[PDB]
Amino acid sequence: CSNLLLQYGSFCTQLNRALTGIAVEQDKNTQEVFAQVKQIYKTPPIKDF
Amino acid sequence: SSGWTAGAAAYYVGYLQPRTFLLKYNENGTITDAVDCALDPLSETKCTL
Numbered sequence: 001c002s003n004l005l006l007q008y009g010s011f012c013t014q015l016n017r018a019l020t021g022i023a024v025e026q027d028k029n030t031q032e033v034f035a036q037v038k039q040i041y042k043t044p045p046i047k048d049f
Numbered sequence: 050s051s052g053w054t055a056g057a058a059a060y061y062v063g064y065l066q067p068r069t070f071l072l073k074y075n076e077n078g079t080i081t082d083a084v085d086c087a088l089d090p091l092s093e094t095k096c097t098l
């Protein structure tokens with residue numbers, strides 16, 4: 001079956017390319033939402049707000 | 050049986066095995082380079098991509 005699938009080849013190369021693009025896009029989405037800033041601020045010990 | 054000498058010559062013997070290969074053809078139709086699939090992970094990635 002692998003030998004027979006060999007002569008298709010380009011089809012699941014295309015599929016893997018598409019899925020990798022999707023995964024990279026997911027990481028991009030999370031970064032662009034949450035990594036708006038880069039200075040990791042932290043709260044002061046005193047909560048005198 | 051003994052009155053003889055052998056000149057300097059050499060040969061090597063390697064056994065074929067069922068494998069997958071990637072081959073590149075130049076513009077004149079001849080092969081220039083190839084990749085043994087399933088040798089090392091780098092070659093495996095060349096093979097998949």
Ligand SMILES: *[C@@H]1O[C@H](CO)[C@@H](O)[C@H](O)[C@H]1NC(C)=O
Pocket residue numbers: 075076077
């Ligand atoms: C292909 O054939 C032509 C004929 O002269 C030659 O000039 C050229 O160098 C060859 N190309 C390669 C990559 O060997």
